[PDB]
Design a protein around this ligand. Sequence first.
Ligand SMILES: CCCCCCCCCCCCCCCCCC(=O)OC[C@H](COP(=O)([O-])OCC(O)COP(=O)([O-])OC[C@@H](COC(=O)CCCCCCCCCCCCCCCCC)OC(=O)CCCCCCCCCCCCCCCCC)OC(=O)CCCCCCCCCCCCCCCCC
Ligand SMILES: CCCCCCCCCCCCCCCCCC(=O)OC[C@H](COP(=O)([O-])OCC(O)COP(=O)([O-])OC[C@@H](COC(=O)CCCCCCCCCCCCCCCCC)OC(=O)CCCCCCCCCCCCCCCCC)OC(=O)CCCCCCCCCCCCCCCCC
Ligand SMILES: CCCCCCCCCCCCCCCCCC(=O)OC[C@H](COP(=O)([O-])OCC(O)COP(=O)([O-])OC[C@@H](COC(=O)CCCCCCCCCCCCCCCCC)OC(=O)CCCCCCCCCCCCCCCCC)OC(=O)CCCCCCCCCCCCCCCCC
Ligand SMILES: CCCCCCCCCCCCCCCCCC(=O)OC[C@H](COP(=O)([O-])OCC(O)COP(=O)([O-])OC[C@@H](COC(=O)CCCCCCCCCCCCCCCCC)OC(=O)CCCCCCCCCCCCCCCCC)OC(=O)CCCCCCCCCCCCCCCCC
Ligand SMILES: CCCCCCCCCCCCO[C@@H]1O[C@H](CO)[C@@H](O[C@H]2O[C@H](CO)[C@@H](O)[C@H](O)[C@H]2O)[C@H](O)[C@H]1O
Lengths: 51, 90, 110, 110, 253
Amino acid sequence: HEQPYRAFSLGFTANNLSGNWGDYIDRQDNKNALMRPARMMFTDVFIPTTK
Amino acid sequence: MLNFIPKRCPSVSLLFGKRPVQRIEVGQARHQLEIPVETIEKIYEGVDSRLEYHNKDYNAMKWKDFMKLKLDAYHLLEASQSETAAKSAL
Amino acid sequence: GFHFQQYIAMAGRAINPVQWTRAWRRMEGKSATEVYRDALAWTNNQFAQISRASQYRAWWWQNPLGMGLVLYGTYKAWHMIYMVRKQKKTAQLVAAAYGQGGQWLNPVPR
Amino acid sequence: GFHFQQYIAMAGRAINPVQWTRAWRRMEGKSATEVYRDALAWTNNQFAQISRASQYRAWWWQNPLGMGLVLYGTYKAWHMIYMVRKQKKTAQLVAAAYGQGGQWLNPVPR
Amino acid sequence: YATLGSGWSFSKVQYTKYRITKPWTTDTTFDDIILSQPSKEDFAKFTKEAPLFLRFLKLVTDVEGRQEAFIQFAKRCENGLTVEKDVYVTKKELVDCLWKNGYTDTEINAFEIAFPADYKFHYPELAVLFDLTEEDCYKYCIRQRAATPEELVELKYTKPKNLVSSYGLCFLGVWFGLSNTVLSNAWFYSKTFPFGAVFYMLGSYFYRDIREKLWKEEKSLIHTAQENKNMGEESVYKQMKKYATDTKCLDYL
Ligand SMILES: CCCCCCCCCCCCCCCCCC(=O)OC[C@H](COP(=O)([O-])OCC(O)COP(=O)([O-])OC[C@@H](COC(=O)CCCCCCCCCCCCCCCCC)OC(=O)CCCCCCCCCCCCCCCCC)OC(=O)CCCCCCCCCCCCCCCCC
Ligand SMILES: CCCCCCCCCCCCCCCCCC(=O)OC[C@H](COP(=O)([O-])OCC(O)COP(=O)([O-])OC[C@@H](COC(=O)CCCCCCCCCCCCCCCCC)OC(=O)CCCCCCCCCCCCCCCCC)OC(=O)CCCCCCCCCCCCCCCCC
Ligand SMILES: CCCCCCCCCCCCCCCCCC(=O)OC[C@H](COP(=O)([O-])OCC(O)COP(=O)([O-])OC[C@@H](COC(=O)CCCCCCCCCCCCCCCCC)OC(=O)CCCCCCCCCCCCCCCCC)OC(=O)CCCCCCCCCCCCCCCCC
Ligand SMILES: CCCCCCCCCCCCCCCCCC(=O)OC[C@H](COP(=O)([O-])OCC(O)COP(=O)([O-])OC[C@@H](COC(=O)CCCCCCCCCCCCCCCCC)OC(=O)CCCCCCCCCCCCCCCCC)OC(=O)CCCCCCCCCCCCCCCCC
Ligand SMILES: CCCCCCCCCCCCO[C@@H]1O[C@H](CO)[C@@H](O[C@H]2O[C@H](CO)[C@@H](O)[C@H](O)[C@H]2O)[C@H](O)[C@H]1O
C-alpha cells in the first residue's frame, strides 16, 4: 500500500505491456531481439542518428 | 392520400386556373376524370400557408378538413366493398 | 464527398490576408447568429447535395465501397498531416526532456 | 493505359503452378514463331485499343495530362518496386563488404 | 435536396469505369445542376430559330385578342431568339400540363400537329404564349429540369481559381504527411492493407447481392403502396360513378 504503481495502457491500437522501458537509470530496450533490427517498422515517425 | 396540396402559383403549377376545368388519371387503367376548378379551389380555403413541404411547392391542409375528405373517401370505398350499400346517396 | 478542390481553394482564400480585409468590410452590420446560421446552412447544403446526387450520379472515384473510401481517405490524410506531425513534435520534446521512451519509464524503485 | 486489373490477374494466373501444367499441355504441337506472334499480336491489340478509344472515350483516371500521368505512375511503381529494392540489397552488400559508402572511396594515397 | 418527379419507378443505377463525354466546346462546360447551383448568368446562351414558333404564336394571339405581344416578341426575336440553352420544358411535359389543367382537345391537337416531338420550349416562349412572367416560367423550367437531373446542363466555362494557393497548401500537405513511416508500418501491413483489401474484394465480389438484399424491403414497400393507391382510387371512382345519377331527382320533381 506504499509501493507505487506502473502506468497502464491497453487498447486495440497500442499498449504498454508487451515491453519494459526500465527505470530512469537502468533502462532497457522495449522491443525484443527478433524485432530490434526492424524498429523503424513499429513507429509512426522515425528520426535517425547523425553519423 | 397525403396532405400535400400543390401551390397554384405559376412558378409551381403552371396554368392552374387558366381554364375552368381540371383533369386527372385514376387507377392502373388510368381512367380520365374531369373536375370543376371551383370544386378544387374549395380546398385552398382550408389550405394552411405556414406549412410548406417538398421544395416548398406543397402546402398542407388543416387536419379537420383533410380528415373529413379522407372519411368521405373511406366511406365510398367501404360502400363499394360491401353489398348491402345504399343504391343512392340521398 | 465532393468539391475537395473547392475546399482547398477556400482554405487558400482564407489564408490570403487581402481576404481578411474583405471579410472585415463584409462584417459591417452583421451578427454572430447570422454568421453561424450561414455556416450551418453551407454545411447542410453540402451534405444535402451528397444525399440527393448519390441516388443517380457517380463520381470519378466511385468504387465498390462508395463514399466510405473517400471518407476514410479524408480521415487518413487528416491523421498523417496533423496528428503524426504533433506526434513527431511530442517525440522530440520527450527525447529532450527525459530521453526516448521517458514517458513510459517505470516508477523509481523503493 | 487500361486493364491494369486484368494484367494483375494475368500475373497471378502465371505464377499459379496449375497454370504451368495447363500451359505445358497447351504447348503440344506449337512453335516458337507462333508463340512470339501471339504475344506480339496481344501487345498490338492493347496499344490499338488505346489509340482507337482515346479519340472518343475517357477513363475514370482522365486528367489534364491524360495518359501521361498513368504512364508516369506505371514507371514510378516499377521503380519503387524493383529498382529501389535492388538498391537496398546493393546497399547492404556494400556495407557488409566495404562499409557504408565503400564504393565511393578515394584511391589509396601514394 | 428534395427528390422531384411524378414517377413511381424505383430506379437504381450501376456505374461503369468510363466518364461522361460531351462534344468539344471552347466556351462551355457540362455539369450537374444540383451540384453546381448555377445562376442565369452562369447558364450558357444560344440562338434558336423562331418561325416554327412564331406561326403558332400568331395564331394563338389572333385567337386570344392580343397582337401587340406578338409584334413585340417578333421584333425582339428576329435574327433568332438568344436564350439560355438548358432552361426548357419538353413538349410532352407541356401537353401533360395543358391536359391536366383543362385545355381543350382542339388546342392540344394544334400543339401536337404544329410542333415536332423533340421540340423544346423555353421560358420566353412560354411567357409570351401563356401571358405569364418570364421569371415564373424560368423557375418552372428549372424545377422540371431538376426533376430529371441525370441530364447535365451547359454552363459558361471558367478557368480554375486559386491554383497558386492550392499548390502551396498541397505542398504543405505532402511535406507534413509523407515525412513519416506510416505507409511502411507493421500496423499498415498487418491491419490497414489486409482489412481494406478484404473489404474491397468482398465488395467487388458481392457488389450486387448486397444491394439486392438491402433493396428488397424498399421495393416491397413501394409495390404495396402503389397497389393500395390504385385499388382505393378505382373503388372511389366507381362508387362515385354509381352515385353520379342522384341529381336528376330534382329536375324530375
Ligand atoms: C489487475 C487486473 C487488471 C486487469 C485489466 C483491467 C482493465 C482495467 C479495468 C477495465 C474495466 C472495464 C472498463 C471497460 C473497458 C474500457 C475500454 C476503454 O475505456 O477504452 C480504452 C481504449 C483506449 O484507451 P487509450 O489509453 O486512449 O489507448 C490509446 C489510444 O486509444 C490510441 O489512440 P489512436 O492513436 O490509436 O487513435 C484512435 C483513433 C481511431 O479513430 C477511428 O477509428 C475513426 C476512423 C473513422 C474513419 C472513417 C470516418 C468517416 C467519417 C467522415 C465524417 C464526414 C467527413 C468529416 C471529415 C473529418 C472527419 C474524418 O481515435 C479514436 O479512437 C476516436 C474515438 C472517438 C470516436 C468514436 C466514434 C464512434 C462511432 C461509432 C459508430 C457506430 C456506427 C454503428 C453502425 C452499425 C452498422 C449499421 O479503447 C481503445 O481500444 C481505443 C480504440 C477504440 C476503438 C474505436 C473505433 C471506432 C471506429 C468507428 C468507425 C465507424 C465506421 C463504421 C463503418 C460501418 C458502416 C459503413
Ligand atoms: C502522392 C499521393 C500520396 C498522398 C499522401 C499519402 C496520403 C494517403 C491517404 C490518401 C487519401 C486521399 C484523399 C481522398 C479524399 C478524396 C480526394 C479526391 O478524390 O479529390 C482530390 C482532388 C480532386 O478534386 P475533385 O473534388 O474530385 O474535383 C476534380 C476536378 O474537377 C478535376 O476534374 P478532372 O476530371 O480534370 O480530374 C479529376 C482528378 C483525377 O484524379 C485521378 O483520377 C488520378 C489520375 C491518374 C490515375 C493514376 C493515379 C495515381 C498515379 C498518378 C498520380 C500520382 C499522384 C497520386 C495521386 C493520388 C490520387 C489518385 O483530378 C485529380 O485528382 C488530380 C490528381 C493528380 C494530380 C497530379 C499532381 C502531380 C504532382 C505530384 C508529382 C507526381 C506524383 C509523384 C509520385 C506520387 C506517388 C505517390 O485532387 C486534387 O488534388 C485537386 C488538385 C487541385 C490543384 C492543386 C494544385 C496542383 C497540385 C497537385 C497536387 C494536388 C494534391 C494531390 C497530391 C498527390 C500528388 C503529390
Ligand atoms: C497506397 C497507394 C500508394 C502506392 C505506392 C506508391 C506508388 C506511387 C506511384 C503511384 C503509381 C500509380 C499507378 C498508376 C498506373 C495506373 C493504375 C490504375 O489506374 O489502375 C489501378 C487499378 C485499376 O484497374 P483498372 O484497369 O483501371 O480497372 C478498374 C476496374 O474495372 C474497377 O473499376 P471500378 O469502377 O469499380 O473502380 C476503379 C478504380 C477506382 O480507383 C479510384 O478512383 C480510387 C477510389 C477512391 C478515391 C480516393 C483514392 C485515394 C484514397 C482512397 C484509396 C486509398 C488507396 C490509394 C489508391 C491509390 C490509387 C488511386 O478501382 C481501383 O483502382 C481501386 C483502388 C482502391 C483499392 C483500395 C484497396 C484498399 C487496400 C489498402 C488499404 C487502404 C489504403 C491505405 C492507405 C494508403 C494511403 C496511400 O486499381 C487496382 O489496384 C486494381 C485492384 C485489383 C484487385 C486487387 C486485390 C485487392 C488489393 C487492393 C489494392 C490494389 C492495389 C492498389 C494499391 C493501393 C492500396 C494500398
Ligand atoms: C508573431 C510572430 C510572427 C509574425 C510574423 C508573421 C509573418 C506573416 C508573413 C505574411 C504572409 C502571411 C501568409 C500569407 C502569404 C500569402 C499567400 C497568398 O496569398 O498567395 C496566394 C496568391 C493569390 O493567388 P491565387 O490564390 O492563386 O488566386 C487568387 C488571385 O491571385 C486573387 O488574389 P487577390 O485578389 O485576393 O489579391 C491579389 C494580391 C495577392 O498578393 C499576395 O500574395 C498577398 C500578399 C500580401 C502579404 C501581406 C502581409 C501582411 C503581414 C505582414 C506585414 C508587412 C507590412 C506590409 C503591410 C501591407 C501594406 C503594404 O496581389 C496580387 O496578386 C497582385 C496585385 C497587387 C494588388 C495589391 C496587393 C496589395 C494589397 C495592399 C496590402 C493589403 C494588406 C492587407 C492588410 C493585412 C493586415 C494583417 O498568389 C501567390 O501565391 C503570391 C505569391 C506568394 C507570395 C510569396 C512569393 C514568394 C516569396 C517567398 C518569400 C521568401 C521565402 C521566405 C524567406 C523569408 C526570409 C525573410
Ligand atoms: C490483460 C491481458 C489481456 C490483454 C493483452 C494485452 C496485450 C498483450 C501483450 C503482448 C503479449 C506478448 O508479449 C511479448 O512477450 C513478452 C511480453 O512481456 C515480451 O518479451 C520480453 O519480456 C519478457 C519478460 O517476461 C522476456 O522474457 C523476453 O525475453 C522479452 O523479449 C515481448 O517483447 C512481447 O512481444
